[PDB]
Each structure stands twice: as C-alpha cells, then as structure tokens.
Subunit: 332 residues, 3 copies
C-alpha cells in the first residue's frame, strides 16, 4: 500500500509526475478522479489552508471530505500500544484507522509535536500509526515534516523561474523570529525538497542550537550528493542572503530545549533581528521570498517584504490545492 | 468588484431584482448557478440559520461551502495595519483574504462588534478588510448590519401582504428585553430596509440612550425622502403599536454604554415590560410579528405571540436560504 | 409522519426491510435516494462514527449533511415548555425544529443524558421535542437508546452467521469496566434488538444496581414472548459466558446513582475484572465479540480479544453507514 508520508520516500520520477499533474490540475480544476470517493481529514491542530484546500480539492474532483477534530467533535485517541486506557483517551488508533478504512478511500492527518520531548515527537508516532493500521492510503497533512507544503513550494518556484530545473539557484532557508517555539516540520521539509531539487542550500539560523534534527541534515546531504546541489549551515545573515535566488523563512523552537522552553525564550528574543526585511532581501540576487503561512507581519517578515512583488507566498498557498489533488489522484 | 455589504450600497432596482430572484429560487430550489464553485463562510461568532442556509444554498446550486471559525479551527486573524503581530493573532487579513481568493469564488463573513468601544466597532473593520483584500466578492453574514436578514425579512413581508409594494404600512421596530446587551446590527438593518421599502417606520425603544447610531438614522431619513415613507422615534409603547401592520422586535445594548455595561444592566432590567405580548399585539391592525432569531421565549416575546398565526418568523428564517442564493448567484 | 426513534416502534417486517435494504446498499453504495436532499445532524455530544457515516451516507446518496453542534457553533437550545428563557439557552426547540424543517429533509439528533437525574433523562425530552416540532422525519443518533447501532449490530450478526434468522443463539450482553459512569443507551438497545431477534439473552452485570431501566427490561420481556427467545439477568460471569454465541460489552453507570456518582465509583472499581478477556471468551461456543466503540483497550476488553478473528466490532462499525442509508432512504 502506497502512502504520501514524505517526499523522501518517493523517487524523483514519481515526484516529478506529481508536480506535473499538479500543474495539469491547476489548468483544469474540475475532474472525476475522486468521483464518489471520500477522504477523512483528521486534525489534531489548527489549520486554514490545509483544511480548506483539501476540502475543496475533494469537491472539485467529485469526492467528499469529512473533517474530524479528535477531542473536539471526534473522540480523543490513544496511540501507545499495550497501555491500559484509563486516562483521557477514549479509543485506540488501531480501531480508529480500521473503522475509517471502512468508510473513506483516503485518510489525511495533521499532528504537531507535543513539544515536551523531542525523542518522542521525532518518532512520528501518529502518522506511522495511521499508515500501519489504515487499509487505505494515508496523507501527511503535517506532523514533523510537511511534504504537501514541499510540493506546493517547489511548484511555485518552478513557475516563478519558468522551468522544472532549479539546479544552480542559491536557496536560503532562514530561521526567523516568533514569540513562541514552534514546529520544525516546515524547515525540515524545506531543507529536504530544496536539496532534492538540487539547489545550493544554506540553512541560516541564530545558533548551533537551532540546527535541524540530524535525520533531515542527513536526508539533505544524501539529496545533494544525488541532485548535484550543496548544503551548508550558517549563523551569519549578510553572507547567507548574499546573491540568494530564493529565501524561505520559518521560525521553530530549538530542539535541545524541548520540555524546557523557559530558557530558550530569552535566546530567541535576542534574535528578533532575523526578521526578513527589505535590507536583507536587498542583499539577494533579486530573489523571491516565501513563507508557508500563517505569518505574523513585522515579526517573521516586514509588511514591505510581504507586499513586495518578489513575495510568492500567496502563489505557494494556492498551489497547496493543486499539488494535493495530484497526490489524492495518485493514491486512489 | 461588486460585494454585498449593505443593501444601502445597492440601487432599488438591483434590490428588487434580488428579491425577485429569491422568489424564483424559492419555487425552483435546485440549480447550477454555482456548479463547481465554492464559498468560504467565515464565522467569528455563533450561528445556526446563517451557517445552515448558506451551506445548503451552495449545495443546491451545485457548489460547496467551506465553513471556517478562526480561533477554533482556522488561525486567529489580525486586522489592524502596520502592527507588530506578537500577540494572539497568527496571521493578517491581508494574507487570509488573498489566500482564500485563490481557493473560493465567494467569501462570507460574520463578525459581531467586540462591545468594548463602539467607535471601533462602528468602523466595520472586519467586513471592510475582507472587501479590500479579497479578489472575489464578499458577503456580509452580519457584522454591524445584517443585509441578508433585511432581504429575507422584506420578502416575507411581501409574501404576507401579497405584493412587492409595502408603501403605506405602519412598521414598528421595537427594542425588546434580553438579559445581555446585544449587537444593534439587526435593528440597524431593519430600520434601513423598512424605510428603503417606503413604510411608515417608528423606532420604539425605552430611552434616548437606545436610539440607533446616527449613521442608520440618517440612512433611514434619506430612504424615507426617496421612498415616500416616514420615520419617527418613540418611547411610548401603546401609541407606537397602535394600528401597526408589522412589528419587528430585537434587543440591543445602549450604544453610550459600550465598554461600560455594568450600569446599563439595571437600566434594561427596568424595561423587561417591552416584551412583545398579546396585549401589545392587540393594539395593532391585525399586524404580523417577526424576529430574526434566535429568540428567548417569555423574555423577548411570549409563547402566545410566537405561536400566533400572525408570527412569520419561521417564514422569514426560511427566506434567508432563498435570498442568499439570489445574492450568491448575482455576485458570481 | 414517520420517524426512526426506536426499533421498538417499528414492526418486525419493517425492520427486516431496513436490514435488507442495508445489505443492498452495502453492495451498491452510490445512489440517488437523497439526490438534492439534505439532513441536519445535530450533535450535543462527541462522535466519530455517527458523524462520519451519516455525512458520507448523505453524500453517497446524492444529498448533503449539515453538521451542527449547539453551544459550539449553533446557539444553545431550550427544551422545557413555558419557561422564562433568561439563562444560558438562546432559543427554543420549537423554533429550531420548525426552522430546520424549512431547510432540510431529515433531522438527526444525538443527545446523551445529563446524568444528574435519571427521572428527567429517561423522558427522552430532546428526541421527543424534535419529533414533536419537526415537520420532517427525525432520526435518533443516540439519546437513551441507540437504534442505528441496533441495526448495524444485527446486520453484522446476520452476516457472521450467514442467515437473517438468529433464533436459538445464546446472546450475552455484559457490563464491562470503564473509569467513568456512562450512558445506558447502547445496553438498552442491545437488550431490545437481541430479544426482538429472538435470541436467548442474558444480561450480565456486577450487581442488581446495574440492571437496566424497567422500560427496557419490559420491552425485552415482550420481545421474547413474540420472537421465541429468552431473557435472564445474571451476576455470575462464568455461567453467563458458558456456551455463548455472541458477547456484546458496554459499560454504563448504575441508574440508582444518577446525581450521586461519588459512591458508585468505588463500586465499579471493584468490578474491573468484568473486562472481556481471552479466559472469558474461551468459555463461549467459539462466540463472536463486539462493541459499539469507542473502546478503551485493556479496560473494557483486552488487546487479544479486540484483535481476535472473533471480534466483529469493525464490521459492526462499518454497518452503521449501510443501515443508516437504509433508514434515510425509507424516511424520505
Ligand atoms: C504557527 C504554527 O504553529 N504554524 C505551523 C504551520 C504549518 C504550515 N502551515 C500550513 O500548513 C498552513 P495552515 O493549513 O493554514 O496551518 C508550524 O509552525 O508548523
Ligand atoms: C443572541 C445574539 O447575539 N443574536 C445575534 C443574532 C443575529 C441575527 N440572527 C441570525 O442571523 C440567525 P443565526 O445565523 O442562527 O445567528 C444578534 O444579536 O445580532
Ligand atoms: C464513551 C461514551 O460516552 N460512549 C457513548 C458511545 C455511544 C455509541 N458509540 C457510537 O455511536 C460511535 P461514535 O458515533 O464514534 O460515538 C456511550 O456510552 O453511549
């Protein structure tokens, strides 16, 4: 059974086919690829674009999406095995996935880390549990990686440069400020797809404490070796932005501080100058800027950068709809 | 780009066309006016009829509605410009409206005042922000005015009297009791459409403190001069109801008490006799009674009045479905 | 007007027709029985299967389901008559049911007891109020009985044994452990349908305090006399399971303790050995096990029993979809 858990699990040819089908759907939005079919969209965290784009995508392809929010409308779910369920959780994923598998044709799941222990969050227990117990394809709607974002992002870049071949472009994945410590998912994914695409990638962040999990630094290293791009870590803003073709920002909490955020607060707070502004974007080679959204203006990026013609964030957001339809069609 | 923010923005001919299309849809509910199209229904406050009627209306016309609740499922939204978003809001309406504009064909928004400062609430910031940043038509699902209610109400009256011409009827918009200070939206709209329809309107309320915002008293004055009706304010129950053809009740908080509700409580509490009962309705010319709903029985109106054959509230509620379909069809 | 409030209200022939149509729909899922029609699914409590199956069922039959959650999105509702609504509730069911009746073709409602007073909960006020004021058919999505579950359960048993005739099988409805006192609805319904099907039913529970409401013990007694089965109450595990053909477990709070749960806690806690495990299932005649779900593993039933090939809970859950489509089709 094929699932869409990570682009890293798919061959380059398969990913190219997806992006091309995405472009095709963007030109002809209505179809019958999901006629009479359905997808269960399970959300354990907030969402506006993911929920909306999947729901509409199912509709446009003749199917129907059922939105569920365990703990809100649906019952809270247990993922640990062999435990005595006498706590808050009402039922086990074993039953949940099998039941939904008797109803829908696809299952999407969004589940951010709990931020108490990275050793546990990095295991990707929720997504893996769904893939294990579900008799139907599972789609990652963002857990510790965000593959749907990767493809929406990739497509937006290919459209902007007018070519599927991004090899040679200088890509800067930069950490940016946010009052709270957030998920590394988007950064992990950006690093993954940018290298898989063969670009010259620089991970820019305040300190070594903000370097991404080794798993992704390794995926990237492997992708570079296979695509022909390059990877490097930098803590210097001016040199990183220098001559960049693409700048993608996202804020995330330092991994070593999971379960202990009080001390990383004063740290991130002394780096709010990492905000993407006009000055930094001026150091780029007329590069484009993007963000996965939601974005806090004048914190993560200034109003000027957001409203600049070089910002393609709205296009990337739109592409979530198109690439996801390509994914659902491929899995059904 | 044309939006449906207020009936006051539309010409009488356009409004008549809407009401007529509403009557047409009421006779033939299924259509293809929205085939393959979608509408995002953004709710910042509770709703049963508005959510249900729009959702079903989209379905019956071949489209699909996506229901969003910022702060609940979707992310909380910032509307102020140039602010540093380091608070509760996650993203700006600038991005939200542009993103949704890449997904849906129409955007509906419901956002009641915050009740802390009428100077801010009366600016209609949320609705205006959506209309400004959205590349697609925006529909007011109730902010400080409730135009969809206006048309459902108007249609119900025309059906009841068997004619589109309501000129000459005595219309009584009366404040009624409620334990809490509420939105003036429905009253502002009733005053607006009743005068635009050319009826003899009397705004009945406990004290001068409950008179509606000047903006609407002026719209009404202008509508009367153009339609041939009349407008007057009254604090005397018996004389207001006398010979009335239509009685529309709604409770709202006194505008001068915004941000300071503790003192207006003992005030409204000494006027719970404004409740619409049989005695008052007996002073009318066999007039009809209606309310936008939700209605608290034996507080806003007695059981007898609600169950009287002269109450058309259920018909008005039904008409929300029909007039809204006419609105969506016109804007698409 | 015909509603689906309880299987007890329907003749055996009608119930057989429903189950057969359910089997038919299971073979041919897509249809036009609800083309252009809609159903309002009103939930006053959590749900995953009921919400999902009804929503998808409406879709597969060409209709649309509108999901409402009073107090969450829709306004809170009052059910008592003649009361002065100056409390938490915003509107009365009288208006709610009549309004929805102008929008949808069917209304489903889920409302668990409040657990404060069984004298009030057993009156089934919410379901009865909807049936009284609604101009369209009402479907019980679980209140104090769960008829939709009954049919999904019955169908699953008929499929398992390969025959519609279950007369002669030993059916064991057993109470099982749960940290909290729950609704008796599922047990009341299991007792009702198992006897209506003519099986030899044994209600197994810790003490006389856990015997179901007389209303259902009487329905069962009447069903046995008409179907040819049998009914008996037992507080002895080993003898009850002995030679059983079917074992259905559910935990519920002792009725005499409504409004006073502190003391029934130490009681249920001394009976956690009622958990369905391999030992007990070994005493059965290679019997099947099922549960309505959600189920807490290693509390209500062990992992081994849940994963045993004799567990048909997933099949029963799937059947909720099929029997409900048969119900909606019959009522429309
Ligand atoms: C602030 C916050 O927690 N952010 C998330 C955004 C994920 C990417 N964003 C999306 O997928 C867009 P939507 O579907 O509207 O959430 C994160 O940090 O990973
Ligand atoms: C109590 C309360 O806050 N009332 C709102 C009702 C608005 C009109 N009512 C509607 O549009 C009906 P629905 O879509 O079900 O809300 C107000 O006072 O403005
Ligand atoms: C723990 C709890 O409160 N349980 C409910 C389950 C009802 C039957 N279960 C269903 O109908 C399945 P779903 O639609 O997913 O709820 C009860 O005790 O009655």
């Amino acid at each position: 059974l094929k699932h869409f858990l990570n682009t890293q699990d798919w061959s380059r040819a398969e990913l190219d086919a997806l992006l091309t089908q995405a472009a095709l759907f963007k030109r002809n939005k209505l179809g019958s690829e999901l006629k009479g079919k359905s997808i269960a969209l399970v959300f354990f965290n907030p969402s506006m674009r993911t929920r909306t784009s999947f729901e509409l995508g199912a509709f446009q392809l003749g199917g129907h999406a059922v939105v569920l929010q365990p703990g809100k409308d649906a019952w809270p779910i247990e993922f640990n095995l062999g435990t005595v369920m006498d706590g808050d959780t009402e039922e086990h994923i074993a039953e949940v996935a099998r039941v939904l598998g008797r109803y829908v044709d696809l299952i999407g799941v969004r589940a951010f880390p709990k931020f108490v222990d990275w050793s546990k969050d990095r295991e990707d227990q929720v997504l893996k549990s769904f893939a294990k117990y579900s008799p139907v394809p599972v789609i990652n709607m963002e857990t510790i990686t965000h593959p749907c974002q990767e493809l929406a992002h990739a497509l937006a870049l290919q459209e902007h440069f007018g070519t599927p071949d991004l090899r040679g472009k200088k890509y800067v994945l930069t950490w940016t400020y946010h009052p709270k410590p957030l998920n590394t998912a988007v950064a992990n994914s950006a690093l993954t797809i940018a290298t898989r695409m063969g670009m010259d990638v620089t991970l820019l962040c305040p300190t070594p404490d903000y370097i991404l999990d080794e798993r992704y630094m390794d995926w990237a290293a492997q992708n570079v070796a296979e695509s022909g791009g390059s990877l490097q870590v930098s803590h210097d803003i001016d040199s990183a932005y220098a001559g960049a073709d693409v700048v993608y920002a996202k804020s995330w909490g330092a991994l070593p501080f999971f379960g202990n955020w009080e001390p990383e607060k004063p740290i991130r707070d002394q780096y709010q100058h990492f905000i993407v502004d006009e000055r930094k974007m001026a150091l780029t080679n007329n590069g484009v800027f993007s963000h996965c959204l939601p974005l806090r203006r004048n914190v993560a990026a200034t109003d000027a950068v957001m409203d600049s013609p070089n910002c393609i964030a709205i296009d990337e957001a739109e592409n979530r709809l198109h690439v996801q339809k390509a994914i659902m069609a491929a899995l059904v």
